[PDB]
Design a binder for this molecule. Structure first.
Ligand SMILES: Nc1ccn([C@@H]2O[C@H](COP(=O)(O)OP(=O)(O)OP(=O)(O)O)[C@@H](O)[C@H]2O)c(=O)n1
Ligand SMILES: Nc1ccn([C@@H]2O[C@H](COP(=O)(O)OP(=O)(O)OP(=O)(O)O)[C@@H](O)[C@H]2O)c(=O)n1
Ligand SMILES: [Zn+2]
Lengths: 310, 153, 310, 153, 310, 310
């Protein structure tokens, strides 16, 4: 069997370099030679206990691109007093009796891990468990970096924006720390700094990082420029606009950018990347979104399919 | 100093003796590790003097033995307790709690959005030591806290 | 043709012993030898005018397990003033022009019966019409009783909890009254008693029943122990807790339970069955849930498929 | 009947000895009425060979005496229990727990709509025996319950 | 000096037949010889954490009629002291430093009583605490009863509707069980019978009582007919419509009633009292409401004035 | 003649140490020798376009205590002058022709000040304008501080919690920086430190200040301990629970505090002050609330009366 067969994908920290490479090689293969009846007669639950339509739409499209039926629910709705209802444990045990795998997004951290304690032999894929993990976001990110850059080690990766609450930068950095010779540049405002605990991880594995007050400092050196939505609710509307201007990317800031440089952004963008940046070849955030279709088919294929004959 | 003549603490044939429990922890261990949930003879002395090394607690549990794990499970409250197994009125062995790897069913994650605050799950924490404290990573939360905070009150 | 072909499944009272056996034999057959392209090119509407995700998720999974496409809606939403909208009659007539069968849940009793007056030759399956019927719940229940017990007659069936408003116990008892030699034990609180009209039915067919103040009275005698959610809103929070303790099932109450004894529960459980009861072999409520996948495929297959060649 | 088969026997000179606790009730009284929260010396015997036949718990609290009302608190968990007010090594007084007026903070109101749950108040139940039925009335929501019901916390 | 001066009013059981008569008397005095400047310069708070428009207005008018000013709020759907985060204790702790008296309604039982421990000098009056007390309603009812029948003793009092959940009927029974020679007739659906504890308490006093299928049954034996709205939500709309033929009252039922007999209703009424009753001499539910002003002034006066001069 | 007669109260910075003391003085006079008919025949409006139950009631009681009548509203979730279509300008333009004074709370900063340009003769008082001003809160705090410590000069004042977003602590600091010899201790989470501009302003005045990890640290140096609730929504529930061990206060912390020291809190409190503090002589947050009545009467009197005779 493949190593991922019948496994639960809950956190990025539970995946090894190898596991990572395997998923990515596969995604590559499926992107080039599709397999639209691979997951024929399989039924997968799409349980969005917490709404997230881009994530969902992406997952479900992958499901159908591989031949699987989908059933599920996007939820937000009349659960406000669903606490006087049954447990998540009981919800999983019922569903695990119907479907062949479970994709789920949920408001509380640890939710997907608990799920796996009750799904029996049904594999659980985390599409998001509160402020904790989002492993398939990180995997479409790596895939995109590797497909545009050519490797995952020896990169100059600049991470920009809200680095404190930005769950996918934390995740991506943790993933990239598994490869070699990478160099990190953090360009956040001081209130939204890369948490200590990440810096400590890096220092321990002896990985080079640096703080810059601006992009332009490091623009000429970076390969991958990873932007993040500054949540404004996370701020004071005053404090926001006082520094906003400092960490907004406009087309004209790339003039000195290396030819290979890619601008990534996980999620919905606003004022952090100006529209003019879109007309340039460094802009790769929509492409990055279409790549989640192959990062996600790779997962589904590997977990549900004992042996893959790509 | 488990020497104390004067009309107190007796010896037992078999079982286990947890000595040098710092005071006001003896009840904490009773409570947390559900040790009274047994019908074997149990002797507890609380606030006995350790000679002069403060006041210690002490627990004697007849016809009952533990595992290295169960003993390691005490390392956080009584990191300096001693566990004496006894067979036939003599102490065939001592032990100290060695701080474990993970920690199941007794802690509580500080994080209020951790799913292990609703559901039929026992808590598990990975344990790892730092300069001046021990960090505890929640199984679910996946978040990590100083043991001092996870020891919320 | 099979006898169920092109029929509307609205109430349990419209089904005969035979009809019942046929559905159940089929469910058995499909459970053992699946037919994933049986309902190929058929389109079925899943009209949940009233939300019920477990019921829906179950139905839809069955649809896909048989090869059918699904379209539909879970509803709750902006119908609060949908009364200044069209009739249910008109909604059915439009939909009956698109789809090959109609599965529907609805807030008002009689809703599914009206539907059948306007669906033309499109079969209508009731997934719930207010406080009236839920025939596929009763059918997965029988299936589970028969598959674990070995028969549907000569059973000691104990029904416990809220017997007054519990629509599926009323339905199950009505179904079981079609078989022979069954013995009923009702263990409800006096405010939530088995309604008179049911007792009268039983007395008339000369079927043995009995009231017990507790389970332990009859534990040694029962084959099937059917539990029901006590709705607390149905009560006074005081009155609730005053008797709650009397009709809550804990693992330690089964010690004297026969080897064949199964604990069933239709729906979400809370405090009525303790979690420790789950680790025992008498616990069969999750299993009972997975059996609705075969009770429901049996229906769909029979109604839409003139001749079944299992 | 000071556990005397051998020697080194449990005694005490001044304080309170609460004897004849039903087996397994012993711990609960330490929990509930918080009797260990003291720098004083306590000795405890769980699952001890009861006076005639069976086991019983026993608790001895050095130089600590308790009130008729304290004693009475116990009537709901150990009514048979007996409290001893020993001084200078001698049993100068023997009290037995008699049904109190009210039972403050130890009981939980079974009513979930009672205001007592959400707030910084102490619980209070009024105690009224319904010929072996003993009914507890909540001070706030004023509903009344059988003690069997309210003793599920 | 007055026995009620600066006393809290929470529960009817804390009032004596003496305290009761005191209130009713003052009430009668205030009804005849108004004191519109009795409570000048006093500020009362009207804390409806639960809204009740009928009760609220009664009180505030009562308040204004004696010349007090009023501060307060209505309906705490998410008001920061009830439902955000603040304790009730702290709310009262705070408002007790602002006003001279507090009137509160609250969704939890015992809430008024709790208040009492945090209100210091400041008397608190209960305008409803969950299903528990509503003293002002009862004082309203007694006053009326006695104003129309001339006594509170030896009455043939019939109560109808929901005697199981009618918090008003329970209290009314308690209060009237403090006078001698009253005889009760309890007409109600079995699903709604008078609680046992009430029946019990009646019997350890020796008060004659009995239960009745319908109102025609005792129509000519009764002085007071006290109707309560039947909560239909409290039962099955089929179940409900079956019984309600025996519990609505129409003028035709009245053909045989005593001339002294009066029909009371705490209001609001839905269809338990037909409108044709509204024009008979027996109809006394809007006058009953009217007397809520005097019953309430009486209380406010008593509590905030050391002695009455009327 | 009084310096504040018919003046607007919007921001604390528009008040002098002179104007401040004036208010505090009158406040102290009114606390001792009440003037319950001072503002007779005046009509004040209480325009809570943002609801704040605690503040609202304070004011209205203050209003009634001086004998004014009150018109107003609370919580403009979609009230036609705030949120439908009407400008605030036009609202004030209109209400300024009806009343003698206006008290308003509003979600936008500068809203009270805008009003001021449309209110003509009619003074407007700020009861909060977004994150900006809350003058009445501060006057409440000073008055208390000075009533318990006997001076507003040379104090050892500690402030705790959210000094970054605590609009109250900022204002309190400004106000107290108008007196001489005060020394501040700022205990707070780094994520919440006292803004720089405040620190700056302190320094261009030469006021001694410093920052502190925790409250035990300075416990015995302080006259006043001013706690502010930490907004947990303002941070990660993991992140939050990590720090809050160093910022809640318990009575045990108090063992070493000065006898003069008092704990203040603008309220509402959640778990930053344990209830055991409530019974120590230092607890002064409910009295603080109580003094809001006098601070507020003082202001209303000053603004609407040409001169005080007390
Ligand atoms: N059959 C037995 C054996 C031992 N003991 C208890 O088991 C412990 C044995 O430790 P010990 O050998 O006596 O050394 P101590 O003198 O107190 O020194 P240590 O303090 O190092 O553990 C003592 O607490 C003793 O009370 C007992 O009561 N019954
Ligand atoms: N100075 C003392 C005296 C007595 N005991 C305890 O006091 C309890 C009561 O002993 P006593 O009442 O004098 O004789 P008992 O025969 O046990 O009384 P009863 O009917 O209660 O058995 C006994 O369990 C004994 O162990 C003690 O620990 N310290
Ligand atoms: Zn209660």
């Amino acid at each position: 069997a493949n190593p991922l067969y019948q496994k639960h994908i809950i956190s990025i920290n539970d995946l090894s370099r190898d596991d990572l490479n395997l998923v990515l090689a596969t995604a590559a293969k499926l992107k080039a030679n599709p397999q639209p009846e691979l997951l024929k007669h399989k039924v997968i639950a799409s349980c969005f206990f917490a709404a997230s339509t881009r994530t969902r739409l992406s997952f479900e499209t992958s499901m159908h691109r591989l031949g699987a039926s989908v059933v599920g629910f996007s939820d937000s709705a009349n659960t406000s007093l669903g606490k006087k209802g049954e447990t998540l444990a009981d919800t999983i045990s019922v569903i695990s009796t119907y479907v062949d795998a479970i994709v789920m997004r949920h408001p509380q951290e640890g939710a997907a891990r608990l799920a796996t304690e009750f799904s029996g032999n049904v594999p659980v894929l985390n599409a998001g468990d509160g402020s904790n993990q989002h492993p398939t976001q990180t995997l479409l990110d790596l895939f995109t970096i590797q497909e545009t850059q050519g490797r995952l080690d020896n990169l100059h990766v600049a991470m920009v924006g809200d680095l404190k609450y930005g769950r996918t930068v934390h995740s991506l950095t943790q993933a990239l720390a598994k490869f070699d010779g990478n160099r990190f540049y953090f360009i956040a405002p001081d209130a939204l700094a890369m948490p200590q605990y990440i810096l400590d991880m890096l220092d321990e594995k002896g990985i080079a990082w640096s703080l810059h007050s601006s992009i332009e400092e490091v623009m000429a050196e970076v390969d991958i420029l990873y932007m993040t939505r500054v949540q404004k609710e996370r701020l004071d509307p005053s404090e926001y606009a006082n520094v906003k201007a400092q960490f907004v990317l406009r087309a004209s800031d790339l003039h000195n950018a290396k030819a290979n440089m890619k601008v990534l952004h996980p999620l919905p963008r606003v004022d952090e990347i100006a529209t003019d940046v879109d007309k340039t070849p460094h802009a790769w955030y929509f492409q990055q979104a279409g790549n989640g279709i192959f990062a996600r088919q790779a997962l589904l294929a590997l977990v549900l399919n004992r042996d893959l004959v790509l | 100093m488990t020497h104390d003549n004067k009309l107190q603490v007796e010896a037992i044939k078999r079982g286990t003796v947890i000595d040098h429990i710092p005071a006001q922890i003896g009840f904490k261990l009773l409570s947390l590790f559900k040790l009274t949930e047994t019908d074997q003879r149990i002797t507890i002395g609380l606030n006995l003097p350790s000679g002069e090394m403060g006041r210690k607690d002490l627990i004697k549990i007849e016809n009952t033995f533990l595992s290295e794990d169960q003993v390691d499970q005490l390392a956080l409250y009584a990191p300096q307790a001693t566990v004496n197994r006894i067979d036939n009125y003599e102490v065939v062995g001592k032990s100290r709690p060695s701080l474990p790897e993970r920690i199941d069913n007794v802690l509580v994650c500080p994080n209020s959005n951790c799913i292990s605050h609703a559901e039929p799950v026992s808590s598990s924490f990975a344990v790892r030591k730092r300069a001046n404290d021990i960090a505890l990573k929640c199984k679910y939360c996946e978040k990590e806290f100083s043991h001092n905070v996870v020891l919320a009150n």
